[PDB]
């Protein structure tokens, strides 16, 4: 079929609206989490702009298009993405009128540009260079956390969030690459969350009391087993022919104690003293007697370790992954400043913590392991992006859309065009800005009206960035509030909202292709 001209955009405008309504609170602590059945058929809860999109199976092309484009920004920030859907279709709701008044969507796409630039100009003029204080990091962390979860949940989790990034900036890494390791853990309540400067393995191998409490940890990560097999035929060697099986029966049990006593050597090679617990870590299993022959010597051998840990352990401890054991010095097997196998429930989760150059900080969350515990697994990594963004930009402003007004004010107050053609677009342009802070207030409390004419006159009074109190519905200084817009965060929505609106605002013929 064909939805011609005005009809094609009438589809575009609509598909934006109802979803924007969902996200008027998906955003802020006021933001209401949303759940998904038909997205899978699973019981699924999520709060965030882009992920909920992908989670749902979204038949409508607009939403289908959006999940991809908001991604690129949701890649960066994670919050303001739950914001981003509003301004876009709202701008459609702006301009469609003008083309319903009659006009070219051309000149309005045109018109948005210089407004986008003055915004981009204003984005510079607004963005407040701020410091790297963990405090300054906390409020940027928690505002995204506050957006995505409860402020309490934001608060209690914020610390570990703004902590690891300090050690990942200890690497002088401008972003967060490692220390991104999150661990959900068996618990009655998601209340428990811990910050492990080192890593956590989940296993003690199968053998307790190996000297599993380890202060001096020289980390052997060995992807090869001490358990090849205890029976006749080798681990990968299978035989249904009789004479070939009698061949492997003798040395299969041996090549274990080959690798076993290599460690028993390697223990004394590393240590010479059972005093320092030497940590063997296996990506695969390890024989009980292997553990036994190791454990009694004080060797703590771990089996069935995870490849990311193997990666992490190699990196965090200055560790090593090994396909052989033999004998090596303590440092040839990277060092963890502390290692403790920690049993919660049945599983003993090895705390390998403050590894030498603890390049990977495991953030451990002990919870019901529901999607509720998954529901808090996002805001953190989301907030991680935010502080990473805050790490990225020293320039960060008040949140709660204090910029919106100060944008919408100046950008509109002056004609950046001193034209109709661009100002027409500019008019629509900076108007769709204010959607967020007013509706937040309007969702919180006081209507769009008062808060705006508050915050506008306030900004008009101020030039300070004054922004909504999301628990009141009238503005405050969001610099003082703590809800803080990273220039890295806030900038990209200006890119997206414009650049997406550009081509989608210009369509007339639409048809099934193929």
């Amino acid at each position: 079929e064909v939805a011609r001209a005005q009809a094609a955009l009438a589809v575009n405008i609509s598909a934006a609206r109802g979803l924007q309504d969902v996200l008027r609170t998906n955003l802020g602590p006021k933001g209401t989490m949303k759940m998904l059945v038909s997205g899978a058929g699973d019981i699924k809860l999520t709060k965030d702009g882009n992920v909920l999109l992908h989670e749902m199976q979204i038949q409508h092309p607009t939403a289908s298009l959006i999940a991809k484009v908001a991604t690129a920004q949701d890649d960066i920030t994670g919050d303001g993405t739950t914001s981003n859907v509003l301004i876009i279709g709202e701008l459609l709701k702006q301009a469609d009128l003008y083309i319903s008044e009659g006009l070219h969507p051309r000149i309005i796409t045109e018109g948005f540009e210089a407004a986008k630039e003055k915004a981009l100009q204003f984005l510079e003029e607004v963005k407040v260079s701020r410091e790297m204080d963990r405090e300054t990091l906390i409020d940027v962390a928690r505002t995204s956390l506050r957006t995505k979860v409860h402020a309490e949940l934001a608060d209690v989790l914020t610390e570990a969030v703004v902590d690891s990034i300090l050690a990942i900036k200890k690497q002088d890494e401008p972003i967060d690459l490692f220390m991104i390791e999150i661990m959900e853990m068996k618990h009655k309540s998601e209340t428990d969350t811990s910050l492990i400067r080192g890593l956590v393995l989940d296993h003690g191998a199968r053998h307790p009391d190996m000297k599993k409490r380890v202060e001096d940890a020289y980390i052997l990560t060995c992807n090869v087993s001490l358990e090849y097999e205890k029976t006749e035929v080798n681990s990968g060697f299978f035989y249904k022919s009789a004479e070939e099986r009698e061949k492997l029966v003798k040395a299969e049990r041996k090549f274990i104690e080959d690798r076993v006593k290599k460690i028993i050597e390697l223990k004394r090679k590393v240590c010479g003293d059972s005093d320092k617990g030497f940590v063997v870590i296996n990506q695969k299993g390890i024989d009980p007697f292997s553990l036994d022959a190791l454990s009694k010597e004080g060797i703590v051998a771990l089996r069935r370790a995870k490849r990311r840990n193997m990666e992490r352990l190699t990196l965090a401890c200055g560790g090593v992954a090994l396909n052989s054991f033999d004998d090596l010095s303590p440092d040839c097997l990277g060092h963890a400043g502390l290692v403790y196998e920690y049993t919660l429930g049945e599983e003993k989760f090895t705390f390998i913590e403050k590894c030498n150059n603890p390049r990977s900080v495991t953030l451990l969350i002990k919870g019901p392991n529901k999607h509720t515990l998954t529901q808090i697994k996002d805001a953190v990594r989301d907030g991680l992006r935010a502080v990473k963004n805050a790490i990225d930009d020293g320039c960060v402003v008040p949140g709660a859309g204090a910029v919106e007004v100060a944008m919408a004010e100046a950008l509109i107050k002056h004609k950046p065009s001193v034209k109709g053609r661009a100002q027409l677009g500019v008019q629509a342009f900076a108007d769709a800005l204010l959607i967020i802070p007013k509706v937040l207030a309007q969702n919180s409390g006081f209507d769009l009206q008062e808060t705006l004419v508050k915050i506008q006159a306030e900004h008009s009074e101020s030039g300070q960035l004054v922004g909504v109190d999301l628990n009141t519905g009238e503005p405050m200084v969001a610099a003082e509030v703590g809800v803080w817009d990273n220039y890295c965060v806030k900038k990209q929505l200006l890119h997206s909202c414009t650049v997406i609106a550009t081509n989608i605002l210009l369509v007339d013929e639409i048809m099934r292709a193929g």
């Binding site: 609509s14 598909a15 609206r17 109802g18 979803l19 969902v22 609170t25 602590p29 006021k30 209401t32 989490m33 949303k34 759940m35 998904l36 059945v37 038909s38 997205g39 019981i43 809860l45 909920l52 989670e55 749902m56 199976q57 979204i58 038949q59 409508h60 607009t62 939403a63 289908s64 009655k188 019901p368 529901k370 969702n443 919180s444 409390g445 628990n471």
Partner: protein, 510 residues
């Protein structure tokens, strides 16, 4: 939505209606299911078998709704049932009841957070004032009464009259063997239900009670090295050839004898590994039996996994099919491993006594399964309510003499704390009346009639509803002392728990 996209079934009206309404659906019976309950519920479980109870969780897990609203909150009700044996009958009703104030406040037009947060701080205020209403504490597990006194409350919160012989029979199962200090175990004390005798013939044999026929002789030793096996007899006779027995006339000769010597070696290897009791979820065979009679290793003819499971659980046994010489890994645990006739049913009996690790095994002699399993249900959720793991349970009025105190506490205070939250704080003190109603439900009078008088009992902690007419006309039964209190904790969770999901399930418009 309007657009072909947007997967969801929840939202907006259907949230402020159907979700809460679907939440309303299931709490309906939980009202009849908590406190003294004269009500009863037929259930077929996909056996088509009827069963009767007052408990929701047994039923609700079965029930399947489109909407996670029902699907979620049960987890909290489980989260209760996980931590606390009963009150789960209540844990659902309050939330569902407290919820529907919101949709009213939504018709009254109160915001999500606005409606939510009032309950929140009031819930904290509750969690603040809730321990202030601790009216007692438990004392001694060794004491049967000190235990049984409470235990009725949960059995009550399942079924009313039976609780008396039961609660005593429970601490007589020795809840006391465990300290209830950082430890307690069902599987050690596990209910074992003997169909037959009387239902009040339900007994206590400390140490395992296995209704399974106790074969061979009594165990070779009472310490018995216990090798439990899933199917150590798959048969040592093979099923092959023509008749699904034999084909050639020469076939039968080797079929019959082969079972013997294999089982002979098998049951010899039971003695060769040293297992002093043989447990076959696999079949019993008289030769193997006679071998188990020769080698004198007590035999178990058939096993539910529960047998194998507990044997795997308790003994440290491992049930494995052995067409294989048995090898003790299972080894022994229980210091006295017996044959017994309990209910005069052959009862496989293992016993070992330890402050922690002792099996003190509830043996229910009973006339009716359909009862004795629900009789099991209350004692289950009663001893699981005994599970607090505070020997002093910081008791509060049981059967809910609390709500009238708190329904007074909050909404009064609820106005003192100001702002539209106050109404959510004042709505917070309302759904307390649920069980006062839910009992007056099965008692048959008005909660208003109840609460008006039970507000007129004012600061009490004692007088409240129940069964009979003293929950009806006065609505006054002493739910501090009928002998009935409840732990602060199981109470403390329900508020805390039913705070969460209720708050939660509202937030979600998708």
């Amino acid at each position: 939505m309007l657009k072909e996209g947007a997967k969801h079934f929840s939202g907006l009206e259907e949230a402020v209606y159907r979700n809460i309404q679907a939440c309303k659906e299931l709490a309906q019976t939980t009202r009849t299911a908590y406190g003294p309950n004269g009500m009863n519920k037929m259930v077929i479980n996909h056996l088509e078998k009827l069963f009767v109870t007052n408990d929701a969780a047994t039923i609700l897990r079965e029930l399947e709704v489109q909407h996670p609203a029902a699907k979620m909150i049960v987890m909290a009700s489980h989260m209760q049932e996980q931590e606390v044996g009963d009150g789960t009958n209540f844990v659902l009703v309050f939330a569902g009841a407290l919820l529907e104030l919101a949709e009213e406040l939504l018709r009254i037009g109160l915001s999500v957070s606005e409606v939510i947060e009032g309950y929140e701080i009031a819930c904290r205020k509750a969690h603040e004032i809730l321990p202030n209403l601790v009216c007692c504490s438990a004392k001694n597990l060794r004491d049967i009464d000190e235990v049984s006194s409470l235990l009725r409350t949960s059995i009550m919160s399942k079924q009313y009259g039976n609780e008396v012989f039961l609660a005593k029979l429970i601490a007589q199962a020795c809840v006391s063997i465990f300290p209830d200090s950082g430890h307690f175990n069902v599987d050690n004390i596990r209910v074992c239900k003997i169909l037959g005798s009387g239902i009040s013939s339900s007994s206590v044999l400390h140490g395992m009670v296995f209704k399974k026929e106790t074969e061979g002789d009594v165990t070779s030793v009472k310490d018995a090295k216990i090798a439990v096996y899933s199917c150590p007899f798959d048969g040592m006779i093979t099923e092959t050839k023509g008749t699904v027995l034999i084909k050639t006339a020469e076939e039968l000769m080797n079929f019959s004898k082969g079972e013997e010597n294999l089982m002979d070696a098998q049951v010899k290897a039971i003695a060769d590994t040293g297992a002093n009791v043989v447990v076959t979820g696999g079949k019993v065979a008289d030769m193997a039996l006679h071998y188990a009679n020769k080698y004198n290793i007590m035999l178990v003819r058939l096993n539910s996994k529960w047998d194998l499971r507990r044997l795997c659980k308790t003994v440290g046994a491992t049930a494995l099919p052995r067409l294989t010489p048995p090898v003790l890994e299972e080894m022994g645990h229980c210091d006295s491993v017996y044959l017994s006739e309990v209910g005069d049913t052959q009862v496989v009996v293992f016993k070992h006594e330890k402050e922690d690790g002792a099996i003190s095994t509830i043996v229910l002699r009973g006339s009716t399964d359909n009862l004795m399993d629900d009789i099991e249900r209350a004692v289950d959720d009663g001893v699981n309510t005994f599970k607090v793991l505070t020997r002093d349970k910081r008791l509060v009025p049981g059967g809910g003499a609390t709500e009238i105190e708190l329904a007074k506490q909050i909404t009064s205070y609820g106005e003192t704390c100001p702002g539209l939250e106050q109404y959510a704080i004042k709505k917070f003190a309302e759904a307390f009346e649920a069980i006062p109603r839910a009992l007056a439900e099965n008692s048959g009078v008005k909660a208003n009639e109840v609460i008006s008088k039970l507000y007129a009992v004012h600061q009490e902690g004692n007088k409240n509803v129940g069964l009979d007419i003293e929950a009806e006309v006065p609505a006054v039964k002493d739910m501090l002392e009928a002998g009935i209190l409840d732990t602060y904790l199981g109470k403390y969770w329900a508020i805390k728990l039913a705070t969460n999901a209720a708050v939660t399930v509202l937030r979600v418009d998708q």
